[PDB]
Ligand binder design. Structure first.
Ligand SMILES: CC1(C)OC(=O)c2ccc(Nc3ncc(-c4nc(C5CCOCC5)no4)c(N[C@H](CO)c4ccccc4)n3)cc21
Ligand SMILES: CC1(C)OC(=O)c2ccc(Nc3ncc(-c4nc(C5CCOCC5)no4)c(N[C@H](CO)c4ccccc4)n3)cc21
Ligand code: NA
Lengths: 285, 293
């Protein structure tokens, strides 16, 4: 990235605790030495001859977002052959971290989450960005009960892959759409949010118990039926309709994020971060 | 310590010194050639006794070493040997834009537009690195033989940084200090938008071969700028320049720093995003320079 700091991140942050890590790198809870504010620092391998294009695109996405519902970005550091991406500290982790302990969320809790995610998606889509990986694991929660979309890794990989693949004159229109856009548009995020709502209500997405390759074939068949909430009586008509409309099969009829923000499930009164503070209290006690 | 990455060795073991390019209070600058590759460098040689304060040179090297961008002069390391500090930097064979226009005369509007775009790219980078150049002018914009525009001479930036750090060390107890006094102590009295103003003056310099008020006593200029009613300068020969150039001058020379556009914002201005802004404009300038020499 053109604006990476060629400086030691430890000169700027005290690494308080390692929060997690794997093949994707490591994530640390850290404190700004000057301000005392908490941040999350993601440390990834970045060696002299490594391919940087995907991490490049991820930083580009983060640096150009300025919206409360997208994780804040505080710059990146290249030091000791590691790239340190400094981002917002969301002290409750992801909704997936939470629901593995609490169990399914209430309808009001899901409605608030969906509203907040839709606010972030409307912003991303207004910038011609697509998240492409909406799911409970990528929706982070801070100690105030606020909701932030995170982890643009898949979006960055696709943005880099599409550019690498980037003569068209013999291509069928459906091939040209893959070469230029990847074969779909920003409305894929709306579908993914509908699946995520089911995930929050039922602790797993539809077909989670089916082999993933069979799932791919099933969804690509003509006649695939969009999924539904299993226990119809547990949920209001508004929630069922939210699922029906977000899981519209044809992208030409699936509503945009801005339009979905007017849906009765997410525009109803009484949706606020207190609903998630309740969830965090259940997680704690 | 001046520099954790300092080379404690004689730079003349690696480089053959060619001509002295310049010299003065700041030290001496030499053209030099790598004994292996034959590549050219510029070496700045400064006196460095064990008793001397290293803070300013430490901060200049820090800027050169950490700020890596296609519009910032390249850095090749530093040497300490026999109480002389040698800062090894990019050889920019055409010298500065001032060296150039003293031979070629005024630049074309397209050439100025290209220079402004390249400088703005370097400034946007520097400002994102939390640095302020503070000495943008034709003499500090170098052109290498590839026609690339490189911001150079961070001596003033380093001096200001060193003075701020020293004054903070002696600020004393803060509990009775007003917030604006604390802000001046931590951040100085102005911000990075000062560089945008300086670029506007530089654009006039490239068009007219002098900055505005060049013939006015420097103390009188300082007084006039602090007067209420001060009018930012303008290009003098209005008909020679396009409305876009006049507007570029108008907005970069916005008097109030709260209303002056950032480097990133200025990069969207018509003058620096118009078609035909390419490196060939600078190579044509260098062709004219070579004909003049
Ligand atoms: C890396 C990721 C997802 O991509 C981004 O773009 C981003 C932006 C801000 C980010 N900030 C942040 N801040 C605080 C936490 C936190 N987790 C906990 C407990 C929760 C229960 O299990 C142990 C840790 N406590 O705080 C956090 N956790 C996440 C989700 O668990 C995480 C941590 C480590 C490794 C991967 C992902 N992420 C993260 C991310
Ligand atoms: C010292 C300075 C400005 O601060 C930096 O950060 C830096 C980085 C690389 C730097 N590299 C470089 N490379 C090559 C030249 C060159 N000048 C000529 C002709 C041009 C016509 O008159 C005679 C010399 N031929 O090559 C050069 N000249 C400049 C501008 O004159 C200069 C030389 C000595 C002292 C101050 C400034 N500077 C310099 C500098
Ligand atoms: Na100079």
């Amino acid at each position: 990235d053109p604006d990476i700091f060629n400086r030691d991140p430890r000169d700027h942050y005290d690494l308080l605790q390692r929060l997690g890590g794997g093949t994707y790198g490591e994530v640390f809870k850290a404190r700004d030495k000057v301000s005392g504010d908490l941040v999350a620092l993601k440390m990834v391998k970045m060696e002299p001859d490594d391919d940087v294009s995907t991490l490049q695109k991820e930083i580009l996405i983060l640096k150009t977002c300025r919206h409360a519902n997208i994780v804040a970005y505080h710059g990146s550091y290249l030091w000791l052959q590691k790239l340190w991406i400094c981002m917002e500290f969301c002290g409750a982790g992801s909704l997936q971290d939470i629901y593995q302990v609490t169990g399914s969320l209430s309808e009001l809790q899901i409605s608030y989450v969906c509203r907040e995610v839709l606010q972030g998606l409307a912003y991303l889509h207004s910038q011609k960005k697509i998240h492409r990986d909406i799911k409970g694991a990528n929706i982070l929660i801070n100690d105030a009960g606020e909701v932030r979309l995170a982890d643009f890794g898949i979006s960055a990989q696709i943005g880099a892959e599409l550019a690498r693949r980037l003569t068209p004159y013999w291509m069928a229109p459906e091939v040209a759409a893959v070469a230029l856009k990847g074969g779909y548009n920003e409305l894929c995020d709306i579908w993914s949010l509908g699946i995520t709502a089911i995930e929050l209500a039922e602790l797993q997405p539809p077909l989670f118990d089916v082999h993933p390759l069979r799932v791919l074939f099933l969804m690509t068949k003509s006649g695939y039926q969009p999924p539904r909430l299993k226990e119809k009586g547990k949920w209001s008509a508004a929630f069922h309709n939210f699922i029906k409309v977000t899981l519209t099969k044809s992208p030409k009829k699936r509503p945009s994020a801005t339009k979905m923000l007017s849906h009765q499930l997410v525009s109803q009164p009484g949706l606020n971060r207190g609903l998630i503070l309740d969830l965090l209290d259940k997680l704690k006690n």
